[PDB]
Write a protein that binds this DNA or RNA. Structure first.
Lengths: 413, 554
DNA sequence: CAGTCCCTGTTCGGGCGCCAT
DNA sequence: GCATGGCGCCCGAACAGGGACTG
């Protein structure tokens, strides 16, 4: 309804998306038709044909508590091309101190983008197909008129509009910062929770005034503390145990340059038995403590730089627990995280993984405001099959697949 | 006939012109059965002659239909397709008869000459000019443009399929209670109605098309078990594939085996147990289709038994949305998997076959995991639900799997069907070192320019064994060392190596392999009742590994 | 260290199956 | 100088990325 059409300057020679559409279940399939019809009726989306050399897939989500199927467009591929647009020309600043709060809340400002209408030339690129079951009919094809739900350019355009919409709250609460990312608001305060959760419902009305009604959940950045590497301690040190312990102490060598292992390996000289117990010397304990102390303060000489993508790596650990890392350059880690199980009665590797990813992503945005490529400890096939059935977010990260197993009893746990 | 629907704007790839390739000589009989077709078309307005101002030409031929009576006017726009915008296809996975629900009354109708009824884009007709010779090739013949939808364009079906959807849309809104399966110009109609209103609805639909320029000849179903749809036989309660006739010839060529395998794969649908792991093992090698090749003794075994299963007459059943869905899988040959999907104890919906080597060193459960995800991502396509499974695996066999494994995995609701062979993880490494076992320190090395190398070990009780190597690889040498330690050791072993590579493959606890050496390493592993294996830095001051590295010198 | 070699695993193209034009 | 589109199977060519060795 408002304004005019913003011109999207795409990279020269660069062509748009061409991702095929991947089969869906009746649950999401039936949830999607209508969803589109409603958007078709309200003139948000039009209907197109094969004349369009572009596509992108679509699927239905169903987040917890709410029983409203949200429609998500995997604009995962399209965004990388429009990076010039939503990074340079229309850049949404990131509040340095956003992470330094005692509570932040996730707001779903999705439907608030169907206001402004899309450029006419660029509309071409945003097409999507909706498959029929057992191919009852050739999947119908549609296209977008108004700002899309997922595109990372939607809020780079709405950015002018949104700041004026939050003018009063931001101007009268200097202790409450906010961050807009894709299709989800990020409001973080500092005061008590009971006097915070009320500021949220109060911010919901402010927006509800100009047509936003979408009910999020609590999360505090102060709860997050670093977990380095713990060098086990025992009374009886078998050769076998000293073998592994040097291994772990060797990887540490690449991260911390002050790691010494010589003195320690000197007591293994000569082919010895494996179970055979060995007593620790004076110079060995002068290092066992030397290393256990140097393994406290993060790696000196490492800073953040937005000039390079963000990379995330996860390693299973068992019991349903998982552990991950977040770095810019190999071995120059940024955050050394850890993930706990959601408790019992939910013994599922895939579900926890998808959960871990979101729980990592969220902290990527919050903290810096980018999204990391996930080296995912799972098979391309084993994931592409249920990575939706357990997804509950309005954002999709870039990722890859690692298959290499841990070496020395996992260098972390 | 033409002009009922709107023309889709098609453009030529930017920078390029149109097709300027001469028409090649044709069979003398074809021309007289072709010109006889071009005039009937110009008569109905499908085509129109042009002048010399049109410098575009594109070869054309002809071929009898699936009947042998009527012919088919085919054009070769291979040089155009390279110049026509890259459309996006709208057609997806073909429909399947096991996904059909039972309807009290059903009929299917077909459109005659369907491509020749959709108006082609206006300013694009100028690039579809074909030149037809006379009769004796004395004087140049006629040259008309494909005023209508061509037959060999770049995305011809994409436009038709799309247009066919828009024409049926209005009829779907008024009648959203009846079933409609539109594949090309062939559509399957049917509902739980009655003869009276049904036939009226059929006439209602025929006349709906008739007005849209879609004439349907009296070539529609007659409402009997003999229902020709998508190449099958849709009976009222059962269903079978196209009466399949397997080719049998004394000698076979690379091509003649291809025409069999694919024909055999098609029968994997309703027919259970059909495999071709070996039959295809002959397709290996950069072969030419005409090249003659004799069947292997194992290959002649499959082809002989498969020839007997096809002799057996079988039928599938239709889907019921109220009842539960169970897919039962079982293992067959080496790296072979066949599965039957059903809902009634004996009536199957669609059987299958999974046979792939996902990696150099797999495993039986590792293959079974993927043999499950292949049926899932194919069961979702037919029905929007992931079915329950009847797997031949013990619940403790799986539990131990994903608990000691690194790459996350998982399988849906499954039970344990006790049908041999039952998949099991044979051997198992020990988490902790063993006491009273010889501590083999194994390592290997190889030269990059000579390709030869020494691989060996040493122990705690003084045990040394190093041998040479003709043409091995540094990484391969390390693997050899591990092999030695399994021949020169008792039921209890302790092994430590400097190579993750080496560590890796074992850690995963594999069954099959394609390295011969590794396929052998397991043979031992299976027997040794308690094994432990540790790792250690390569070029490090570590003890034990210090000396065996020194031993593989020169 | 930048440069090579191995080894694995994914992606592409080519021919066949079947459906339809 | 013998066509299009879709899905499927199978197979070797090409491409990719990670670890270990080398002047």
């Amino acid at each position: 309804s408002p304004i005019e059409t913003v011109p999207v300057k795409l990279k020269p020679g660069m062509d748009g998306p061409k991702v095929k559409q991947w089969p869906l279940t009746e649950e999401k399939i039936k949830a999607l038709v209508e969803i589109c019809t409603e958007m078709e009726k309200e003139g948000k989306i039009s209907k197109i044909g094969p004349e369009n050399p572009y596509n992108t897939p679509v699927f239905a989500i169903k987040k917890k508590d709410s029983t409203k199927w949200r429609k998500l467009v995997d604009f995962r591929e399209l965004n990388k091309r429009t990076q010039d647009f939503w990074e340079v020309q229309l850049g949404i600043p990131h509040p340095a101190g956003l992470k330094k709060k005692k509570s932040v809340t996730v707001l779903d400002v999705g439907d608030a983008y169907f206001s402004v209408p899309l450029d006419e030339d660029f509309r071409k690129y945003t097409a999507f197909t909706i498959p029929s079951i057992n191919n009852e009919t050739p999947g119908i094809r549609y296209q977008y008129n108004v700002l899309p739900q997922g595109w990372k350019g939607s809020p780079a355009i709405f950015q002018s509009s949104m700041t004026k919409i939050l003018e009063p709250f931001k101007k009268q609460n200097p202790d409450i910062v906010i961050y807009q990312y894709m299709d989800d608001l990020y409001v973080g305060s500092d005061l008590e929770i009971g006097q915070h959760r009320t500021k949220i419902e109060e911010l919901r009305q402010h927006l509800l005034r100009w047509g936003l009604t979408t009910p999020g959940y609590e999360l505090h950045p102060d709860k997050w503390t670093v977990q380095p590497i713990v060098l086990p301690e025992k009374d009886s040190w078998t050769v076998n145990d000293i073998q592994k312990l040097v291994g772990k102490l060797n990887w540490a060598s690449q991260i911390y340059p002050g790691i010494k292992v010589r003195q320690l390996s000197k007591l293994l000289r000569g082919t010895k038995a494996l179970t055979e117990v060995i007593p620790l010397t004076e110079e060995a304990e002068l290092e066992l403590a030397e290393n256990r102390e140097i393994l406290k303060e993060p790696v000196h000489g490492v800073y953040y730089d937005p000039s390079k993508d963000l990379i995330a790596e996860i390693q299973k650990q068992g019991q349903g627990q998982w552990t991950y890392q977040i770095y810019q350059e190999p071995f120059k880690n940024l955050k050394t995280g850890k993930y706990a199980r959601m408790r019992g009665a939910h013994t599922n590797d895939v579900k926890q993984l998808t959960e871990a990813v979101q729980k990592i992503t969220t902290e990527s945005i919050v903290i810096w405001g980018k999204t990391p490529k996930f080296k995912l400890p799972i098979q391309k096939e084993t994931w592409e099959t249920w990575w939706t059935e357990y997804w509950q977010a309005t954002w999709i990260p870039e990722w890859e697949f690692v298959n290499t197993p841990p070496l020395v009893k996992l260098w972390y746990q | 006939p033409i002009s009922p629907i709107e023309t889709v704007p098609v453009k030529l790839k930017p920078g390029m012109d149109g097709p300027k390739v001469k028409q090649w000589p044709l069979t003398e009989e074809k021309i007289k059965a072709l010109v006889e077709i071009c005039t009937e078309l110009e008569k109905e307005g499908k085509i129109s002659k042009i002048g010399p101002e049109n410098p575009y030409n594109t070869p054309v031929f002809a071929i009898k239909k699936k009947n042998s009576t009527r012919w088919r006017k085919l054009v070769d726009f291979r040089e155009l397709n390279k110049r026509t915008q890259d459309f996006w296809e709208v057609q997806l996975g073909i429909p399947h008869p096991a996904g059909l629900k039972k309807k009290k009354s059903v009929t299917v109708l077909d459109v005659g000459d369907a491509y020749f009824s959709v108006p082609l884009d206006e300013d694009f007709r100028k690039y579809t000019a074909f030149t037809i010779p006379s009769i004796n090739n004395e004087t140049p013949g006629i040259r008309y443009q494909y005023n209508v939808l061509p037959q060999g364009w770049k995305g011809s079906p994409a436009i038709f399929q799309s247009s066919m959807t828009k024409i049926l849309e209005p009829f779907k809104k008024q009648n959203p209670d009846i079933v409609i399966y539109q594949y090309m110009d062939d559509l399957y109609v049917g509902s739980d109605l009655e003869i009276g209103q049904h036939r009226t609805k059929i006439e209602e639909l025929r006349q709906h098309l008739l007005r849209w320029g879609l004439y349907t000849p009296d070539q529609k179903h007659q409402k009997e078990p003999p229902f020709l749809w998508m190449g099958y036989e849709l009976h009222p309660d059962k269903w079978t594939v196209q009466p399949i006739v397997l080719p049998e010839k004394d000698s076979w060529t690379v091509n003649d085996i291809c025409k069999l395998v694919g024909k055999l794969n098609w029968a994997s649908q309703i027919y259970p147990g059909i495999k071709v792991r070996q039959l295809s093992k002959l397709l290996r090698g950069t072969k030419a289709l005409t090249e003659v090749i004799p069947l292997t003794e194992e290959a002649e075994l499959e082809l002989a038994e498969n020839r007997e299963i096809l002799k057996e007459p079988v039928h599938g059943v239709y889907y019921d949305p109220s009842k539960d869905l169970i897919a039962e899988i079982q293992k067959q040959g080496q790296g072979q998997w066949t599965y039957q999907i059903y809902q009634e104890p004996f009536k199957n919906l669609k059987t299958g076959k999974y046979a792939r080597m996902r990696g150099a060193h797999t495993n039986d459960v590792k293959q079974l995991t993927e043999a499950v995800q292949k049926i899932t991502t194919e069961s979702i396509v037919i029905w929007g639900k992931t079915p329950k499974f009847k797997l031949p695996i013990q619940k403790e066999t799986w539990e131990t799997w994903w608990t000691e494994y690194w790459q996350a995995t998982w399988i849906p609701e499954w039970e344990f069907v006790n049908t041999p062979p039952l998949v099991k993880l044979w051997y198992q490494l020990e988490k902790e070192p063993i006491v009273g076992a010889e501590t083999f320190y194994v390592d290997g090395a190889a030269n990059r320019e000579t390709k030869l190398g020494k691989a060996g070990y040493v122990t705690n009780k003084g045990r040394q064994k190093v041998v040479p190597l003709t043409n091995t690889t540094n990484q391969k040498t390390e693997l050899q060392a591990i092999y030695l330690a399994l021949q020169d050791s008792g039921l209890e072993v302790n092994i430590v190596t400097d190579s993750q590579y080496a560590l890796g493959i074992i850690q995963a606890q594999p069954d099959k392999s394609e390295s011969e050496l590794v396929n052998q390493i397991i043979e031992q592993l299976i027997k040794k009742e308690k094994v432990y294996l540790a790792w250690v830095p390569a070029h490090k001051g570590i003890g034990g590994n210090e000396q065996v590295d020194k031993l593989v010198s020169a």
